[PDB]
């Protein structure tokens, strides 16, 4: 009895995600794609790169 | 303090049956409301049901 | 609509008794985690965590006792 | 709408007992910081800081003792 | 009067034994909260609260021992 | 997959709450090691090491308490 | 990322309270050192350095006191 | 060839396939902690993993026993 | 062949093979220091060594106890 | 078998609520719409707004 198994696969991932925050006047807070409260020194961004 | 309230709810169930054949209809559904302060993520709901 | 037994009723009485404690403990823990050393946050959290511990103990022991009172009667049908 | 247990009540008794100490300490530190070299300020702060320390201790030890009682009563249901 | 069992009688003997502790312990707290840093107050509260602790533990343990005597006799009617 | 339990999700809260303290401590120590006699640096390091100590205590105590709450419930299935 | 705890919030309260002393002392030092034996310089330097000593001591003692208040409250979580 | 599994086996397997990876996470944690015992970052993690493992094993066993006694009680009435 | 060793034995021994030489380094430093008790470079070494040894022996014994409890809880359910 | 579901909803809330308590001269405590008076020392009333 003959049993044969053959397999092929190809994968690619590429690009970035961005998020961050800014505080102005210490009176208005702005944040970008954050699901959480922020420490309000502001001027803080992240770019997560995958390739 | 003075307060007033008015409410109104109308429901229609519709069922198709043959003569002399017993039949049943049964349903329930849930309705949600968004609590204030969406950072404080929460919901309220109630279920209405009828048979 | 779903079926709920007598033990479910007994248990549920506690849940509807402690109206909000389940949310209070979560938010008090996040407020503490934001500043792990603030005497007012520590003093609040110690209370809420203690009340939670007692709630879960009293609930589970009560349901256990009722289960044994029932099994002791069912045994006599035989 | 709040919800409070018994340990909550016991704890809050101290807070409603000491009317203002939590603000008093913060303002005494606030002015002292502006002139750390003044004796009258140092002498005032030395007192307030101590009152505060004893307040927080007596609070937490009482809440523990009560929790330890309840935990021992509930144990006897089973 | 409402129906009361033998275990209720046993339980109540303690409460009626300690006539006033039940409230002395609360007044002591209300006073001590006024000036948490008075050693004359602290020395009194330590005593009252220790007494309360021993009272509740003796109560529960006694009740349980009688429950287990009765259960052991009832078992043999079969 | 990063499978995490309940205790894991609790512990992770503190790690995300103290945003940067872990690195800050290491850096403060790294620089202070080069010039032990700078008071402007000693004063910084005293505060960072205090914060670290309190954070690690609160975290491990909270995890320990939730372990006992779970074990107590599990015990009653039988 | 510039995370700061409550002890930090207290220490920085002094550092931002004594507006300039850290620079003032650094200047007075160099002036005096450039031409010692000047009574006008010595008199000023004495004052600045003397109060700088008090500033640093008061700050560090305050932080340690707070730290042990918090550690004592955390110990009662168990 | 492949194991016959009963019903209790299915119950146990639900836990085994519930904690996908804990079985090995615990071991890796131990290996590195034992390599450098004095690191509180290692310690703080290992404490959590070990506690999760304890609860998992305990719940699994207690559950199996309950099903055993239900079955035994039903079987007794055949006589 | 080798003296029989169980699971707990194989857990305890993991620590010993983790701290490769500490068991010797502690006695070495102890003797060097006892040779000249008033030397700060020796004192500052031995403080570190002894602290490490304490933490190691302690965490070892606690972990072995926890793995005894996890087993006893399971064995009890056989009956 | 065709199964169809349709749902529409509108929700709106607007205005302000007022409550608070003030200590007056170590003479009287006065409070408005507190259901059990927190009796804050000193004074401040609060108006809570949502829209």
Swiss-Prot record, chains A, J:
Instruction: Describe the inactivation phenotype.
Output: Insertion mutants are hypoinvasive in the HEp-2 cell assay.
Superkingdom of the source species: Bacteria
Cell compartments where the protein resides: Cell outer membrane
What is stated as this protein's family in its record?
A: Belongs to the bacterial secretin family. T3SS SctC subfamily.
What does the UniProt function comment say about this protein? Component of the type III secretion system (T3SS), also called injectisome, which is used to inject bacterial effector proteins into eukaryotic host cells. Forms a ring-shaped multimeric structure with an apparent central pore in the outer membrane.
How this chain assembles, per its entry, is:
The core secretion machinery of the T3SS is composed of approximately 20 different proteins, including cytoplasmic components, a base, an export apparatus and a needle. This subunit is part of the base, which anchors the injectisome in the bacterial cell envelope. Forms a stable homooligomeric complex. The complex is composed of 15 subunits.
Protein name stated in the entry:
SPI-1 type 3 secretion system secretin
What residues of the intact protein does this structure contain? 308 to 358 of 562
From Swiss-Prot, chains H, I:
Changing residue 74 to A: reported impact? Shows a specific deficiency in the secretion of the translocase SipB/SctE. Shows fully assembled needle complexes, but has a reduced number of needle filaments. Is able to invade cultured epithelial cells
Q: What is the effect of changing residue 76 to K?
A: Shows a specific deficiency in the secretion of the translocase SipB/SctE. Retains the ability to assemble needle complexes, but is not able to invade cultured epithelial cells
> What is the superkingdom listed in this entry's lineage?
Bacteria
Subcellular compartments: Secreted; Cell surface
Q: What is the effect of changing residue 76 to A?
A: Shows a specific deficiency in the secretion of the translocase SipB/SctE. Shows fully assembled needle complexes. Is able to invade cultured epithelial cells
Q: What does this protein do?
A: Component of the type III secretion system (T3SS), also called injectisome, which is used to inject bacterial effector proteins into eukaryotic host cells. PrgI/SctF1 forms the external needle filament that protrudes from the bacterial surface. Is probably involved in the transduction of an activating signal, thought to be mediated by the distal tip of the needle filament, to the secretion machine. Required for invasion of epithelial cells. Required for the secretion of the effector protein SptP.
Name used for this protein in its record: SPI-1 type 3 secretion system needle filament protein
Species: Salmonella typhimurium (strain LT2 / SGSC1412 / ATCC 700720)
